Amino acid sequence: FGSLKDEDRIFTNLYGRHDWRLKGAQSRGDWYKTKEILLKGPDWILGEVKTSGLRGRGGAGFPTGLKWSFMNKPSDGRPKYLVVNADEGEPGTCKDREIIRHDPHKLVEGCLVGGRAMGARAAYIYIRGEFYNEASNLQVAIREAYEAGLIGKNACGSGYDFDVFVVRGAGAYICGEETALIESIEGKQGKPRLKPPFPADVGVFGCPTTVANVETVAVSPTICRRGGAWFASFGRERNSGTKLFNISGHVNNPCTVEEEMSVPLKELIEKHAGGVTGGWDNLLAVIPGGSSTPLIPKSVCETVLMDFDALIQAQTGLGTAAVIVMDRSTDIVKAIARLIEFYKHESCGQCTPCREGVDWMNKVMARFVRGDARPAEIDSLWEISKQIEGHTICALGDGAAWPVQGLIRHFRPELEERMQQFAQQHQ
Amino acid sequence: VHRDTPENNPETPFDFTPENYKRIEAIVKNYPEGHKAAAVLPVLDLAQRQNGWLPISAMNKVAEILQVPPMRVYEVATFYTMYNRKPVGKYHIQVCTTTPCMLRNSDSILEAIQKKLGIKVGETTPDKLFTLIEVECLGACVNAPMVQINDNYYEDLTPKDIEEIIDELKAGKIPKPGPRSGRFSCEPAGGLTSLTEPPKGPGFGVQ
């Protein structure tokens, strides 16, 4: 990992933000060399990302480099599409929508340059309609370029070019899975399918699709434009790259910054800009993932670098790429229930473990917080959480327990004493 | 709320403006043929727009256009959230309350509305124009307890200036759907500068 950073220069993977929002020639960075890329054999791009080997921003492992050079090697009778989440499911994510808001010109390229690797046919994106204003403008960004003849059907210089069809959702979590999105792109109700039909690259719209994420297809052109040997810059021999973090919930100026891997949380939280709560003596009870990781106390987290597998060393890792912390007044038990009260409303409801199994917790979590009937429950409530893992289809269950699974870990007494606080009270 | 209809507007009636039948040519144009059969997500919502909440004869109408048995519609309108089956107001407002939005005390931008606006939660204002809810997972938690109105959002708010954002709206004034205070784009501040540059003299991986 080198020098234990993760610095930020003007040399980064994102071109500009406050400079130019509208259309043009991509005055400096973008749309630079194209006809040379596409005219060379497609699999040249395939595995040429391996110089980086992006883990992927979809909240998981499984480097993006494999799945595209993965099946969808051949082609037979039926077209292939691209479905790239723009959605945000996790509370406090916020990383998305900043990419789109002030610089859309990147991703329409990101597909066209990207889609050629798939050998795909069309391009769908998807956006939660809950963003009405910013998402409305992409069409202009599509038009303001696409109208110039930059895309389709040969554009430019190849015999292969195809346009991008925006769509919208409503009350979606649906980006909560692939093999759901490709279902509610269709117009059924969205109940995500079983994971191994034929996994997500066989059963699809009518025909094989691949579900990418935003900065997985956003940073691909610039990492195939230059690459290197700088493609692997920071992070150890395992995880490599520089992703975006967006700090939220206590800071001086919670705001995004581009930061490379293996950055410790004690300098990163304090920096960009201040630590404005107590940098210490505010107890710094932290959540690595947005909703997908339980607490860490004042322990090795602060020296624990943000590298992925570095976090699996602790009791939980995070792929979500977000930060929420706390200081003093926020009662964690009080502040984790409204993370659970959230889950109960976003779940499909097919499976018997998820449905009727999350409420069993959510109905009891309003006992502990309020303070109420006796311990030895905690010992059970742990087993429930241990009882939903292989039992649910999607990850929302595997992402349902961890907050409670990792609350019972790391804080014993805060509960034990409160059940007394109402016990002595009853007396 | 309940998900059964007590025969309100079986024949409301309802219909689309002949200006709208020329767009539905474009929507179906998106999809391949023979599977078309659901464009329902925009088409059912466009109908909400022409009206402002869709009665049960709206749900029956699109079926005659899309030839799907209209329990393959009443379903889809009871799953998602954005659609409003019952009537609403002129402004349908949201207060994001979630772990991050709780940490910055969204209750600030929430109540002190009851003392201002003078209505309870989940209840439309006695006339029309205002109602109140709260939701989860929209936009940014990087901002303050941000608030949504209808088609826009007011980022980085505080109890002081939201008194205005409603009250200037009661006057008919629309105050800039952006993070009014602090940094306008939600900037890093701490390396915002960066001095943008062309991409380092390309010709790189030409090989």
């Binding site: 346009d163 | 709208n20 767009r23 474009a26 999809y31 391949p32 023979g34």
Partner: peptide
Amino acid sequence: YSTYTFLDLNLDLSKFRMPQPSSGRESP
């Protein structure tokens, strides 16, 4: 900013410029 009026957005440049579609059939 335009609360209604998705029209020309959907029906102006998109309507003429979304070719063909072939899209096949699927009769069914």
